[PDB]
Target: Capsid protein VP1
Amino acid sequence: LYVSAADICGLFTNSSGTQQWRGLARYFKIRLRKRSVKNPYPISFLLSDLIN
Amino acid sequence: PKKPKEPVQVPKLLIKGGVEVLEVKTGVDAITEVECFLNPEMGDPDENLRGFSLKLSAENDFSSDSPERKMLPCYSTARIPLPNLNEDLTCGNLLMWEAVTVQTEVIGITSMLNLHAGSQKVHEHGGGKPIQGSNFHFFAVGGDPLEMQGVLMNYRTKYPDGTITPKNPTAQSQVMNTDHKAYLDKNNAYPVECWVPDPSRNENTRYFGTFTGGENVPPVLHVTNTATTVLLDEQGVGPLCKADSLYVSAADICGLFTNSSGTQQWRGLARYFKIRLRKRSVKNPYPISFLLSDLINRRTQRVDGQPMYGMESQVEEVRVFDGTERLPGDPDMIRYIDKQGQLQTK
Ligand SMILES: [Ca+2]
Model:
């Protein structure tokens, strides 16, 4: 399960004025289940990768 | 009014286009026709002079012969990636592509009528000397790479680094030598003067070629879109594409181009190909224990144990017991199977 994020939350300005970024962490709550799918790759695809 | 007669059922074109068209999910009885070409690899001595070779070294010594890479014509080769026939066959059947029919042609044959192009003056006030000399026209179509044979002359020739050559030639290499087997696995490397296709090992390709060697012979070239070469064997099968790949090879030396100073160099032309494909039901010749043996041998750790196989093996006796028999009087007996039947020494 591939989870990716990018949270830039503005510019922190220092005492001398020198700005710099600031980010915060991001929570994830993924609800999964078991999906019945069809086998895409039989042993004909699988034998032919040995010859590959 | 009067309706015309019903037109004859021809095969239905689904999509014409480039190489991206092969990906279409079609039925079982689909047929494709791949049209392609190969450029000759004649040496190309600079960027302005594609299709020619470098000028020929005239009289090298037989012992100290050392040619250069730009004057050796090489074989052309190419692999055409085919998509997989992803099906759901039973009892170990598959589908593979089959090269049914090739239809080849040399592209550019009337370019040799250019006589005002730095060719040698044919007589005192004549035109230009046309391209003529030793010519070789080859093409090979198969589902495997072109397996060839290293047979040359003058084994003491010092070839350059770019050309791949027969390894360690002897005097036996000037005739048939079984040690010089190789594939055609690289474009513009294998020179024509060292490598002939192997008559003993091209079980899956169909290679066709002719050679005519003379000081001045006519290059006779025919150009036609109705000629048709059938690639089927005695059993009615063509080149099967084991890996989903179609291998196309060629070599077209047309002759020697004599310059105005009298200095000769080669000339090559391209070669059109038109392979007609179909889908063949074959069987799986291999058991399931080749799939699983390759899965295990890349997930189990490699153990550097003591030798348990070979000439320094440490397995001393293996005995196989199957079924019951009456008690034999010799416990130190020796039993095996020789060629077909169970034999029993002492
Ligand atoms: Ca053979």
User: Anything to note?
Assistant: Residues 1-346 of chain B form a domain with the Polyomavirus Vp1; Chain A fold (CATH 2.60.175.10). The longest helix of chain B spans residues 291-296.
